[PDB]
Write a protein that binds this ligand. Structure first.
Ligand SMILES: NC[C@@H]1O[C@H](O[C@H]2[C@@H](O)[C@H](O[C@@H]3[C@@H](O)[C@H](N)C[C@H](N)[C@H]3O[C@H]3O[C@H](CO)[C@@H](O)[C@H](O)[C@H]3N)O[C@@H]2CO)[C@H](N)[C@@H](O)[C@@H]1O
Ligand SMILES: NC[C@@H]1O[C@H](O[C@H]2[C@@H](O)[C@H](O[C@@H]3[C@@H](O)[C@H](N)C[C@H](N)[C@H]3O[C@H]3O[C@H](CO)[C@@H](O)[C@H](O)[C@H]3N)O[C@@H]2CO)[C@H](N)[C@@H](O)[C@@H]1O
Lengths: 265, 265
């Protein structure tokens, strides 16, 4: 009745997760079933499967509800500046819009968190320092980003019962896609430094909506479904959760080509 | 529209929380209102109000769902032993049955957590080491426990919009109450040691139900209401949350006397 650390690791191996993999996980912890240790069983099983040479990653983002108050150029009105909690990669909470597992991973001892607040990833394992180092603050879903390093390292992405449109890596595909009409987001962000709070503008392609017009809000799920329909990736149960496992470089290139075929030239 | 770290600290001062206090908080974060930093705003405001000489505490307990499998003497059947995650005071999650604030406090850098799993408290501040040191593993709600040290240190308890029957300190009153028919709980618990997992039986008065028969499940709230009705404690809003602040020694002695008057001799 209880899914365990041992049984989940067996399900992960049967799905294709391998010793030494860098694995990025999107989880719906409720769908996994009754767990003896809650979400930490999932983290433990992932670490056991990849071993000390692997790395476990998740999309952390940043719990910053102050974006309801910015004006027209993305900056904070001066009566609110001293009240917005600044971003600390070691202390700021991961966003919980898509489950508690990122925050659970972030607070696991040894986990590192990258410096771009909205695009931050958490990494736990062999390559955690490299995955989270020198995150570019502008266009943090593109070159030199942790999502680009996951593709370069030959990483994988696991949708552990999570909706397929929550696959963060496809934002890296939107960034790379050579198409016109790509939407942009600008916002001012507070950073915590050893000398006090310092502000900075952030520019990036808007990941709060489809990269261009004419796309449904959940169009990432259709891209994943077509990817699986083409015979790529792997499906199977992780505990009680229907899960999907895909290669990071493959799904990224598939996402770029999916966009460059319907738009641009 | 946004309750802030500054405005919450002002509400806490108006309620009676003082510089240097050791404060134990039970919070219903939803009732506080819209917060710029989520639960961490509450933790920050409490720390600002008590200053570096104060201490912030919460009831952590332990997320251990394995108690559905124990037999008659409280022990784990041998086919489940290696699957139960052992208790690590630095890694085990705080229970989330009564809100996320204990876990948020537990994962705040510098917070310490005591050694008795089911009765564990988290403490952040000047006296954190003393509050969490040498927690007796048997009858962890009594002598030498963190709840006893809060009374001895002249601490306070803040019900920040939380239901009044979640006041953990009244379990210390149940332990001290010289009354007959007090119910007992025994359970086997796994501990993580530098040499591997070690098991141990735990005995204590059962805090999963009223200490004796004839009491409603929520009878702590009536004790708090009578305490406030007698002109003790303080009421007021913390943000949008109706809150109660009480002296730890006073509410403990009131709880003991409440029990010794209706039962025993
Ligand atoms: N979706 C409509 C847009 O939502 C924007 O706000 C959105 C963003 O703040 C945020 O979008 C995040 C994004 O920040 C983050 N960097 C990437 C992440 N995939 C997005 O996630 C969002 O979109 C996905 C897919 O629909 C959902 O699964 C997720 O729950 C949703 N929050 O979530 C909000 C809800 O979508 C703005 N209100 C405006 O541009 C517009 O209303
Ligand atoms: N309440 C009935 C009892 O619940 C027991 O299980 C209970 C315990 O495991 C646990 O009780 C915890 C206790 O562990 C912990 N050390 C102290 C804490 N105050 C209690 O909390 C419990 O009681 C309070 C008041 O009703 C509730 O506010 C709280 O949500 C509830 N979980 O919560 C469970 C639900 O009450 C057993 N099932 C059995 O003895 C009996 O069914």
């Amino acid at each position: 009745s209880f899914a365990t650390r041992t049984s989940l690791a067996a399900d992960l191996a049967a799905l294709g997760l391998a010793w030494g993999d860098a694995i990025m996980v999107h989880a719906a912890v409720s769908r996994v079933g009754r767990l003896l240790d809650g979400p930490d069983t999932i983290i433990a099983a992932l670490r056991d499967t990849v071993g000390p040479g692997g790395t476990v990653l998740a999309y952390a983002d940043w719990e910053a509800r102050y974006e309801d108050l910015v004006d027209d150029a993305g900056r904070v009105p001066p009566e609110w500046r001293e009240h917005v909690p600044p971003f600390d990669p070691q202390r700021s909470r991961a966003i919980r819009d898509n489950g508690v597992l990122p925050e659970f991973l972030r607070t696991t001892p040894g986990t590192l968190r990258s410096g771009n607040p909205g695009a931050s990833l958490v990494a736990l394992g062999a390559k955690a320092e490299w995955f989270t180092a020198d995150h570019p603050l502008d266009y943090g879903y593109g070159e030199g980003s942790p999502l680009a390093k996951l593709v370069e390292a030959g990483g994988k992405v696991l949708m552990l019962g999570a909706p397929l449109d929550t696959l963060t890596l496809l934002h890296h595909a939107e960034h790379l896609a050579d198409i016109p009409g790509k939407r942009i987001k600008r916002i001012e962000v507070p950073f915590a430094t050893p000398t006090g709070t310092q502000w900075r503008m952030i520019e990036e392609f808007d990941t709060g909506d489809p990269i261009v017009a004419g796309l449904a809000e959940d169009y990432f799920a259709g891209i994943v479904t077509e990817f699986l329909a083409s015979g790529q990736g792997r499906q199977g149960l992780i505990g009680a959760a229907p899960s999907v496992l895909v290669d990071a470089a493959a799904i990224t290139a598939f996402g770029v080509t999916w966009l460059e075929k319907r738009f641009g030239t």
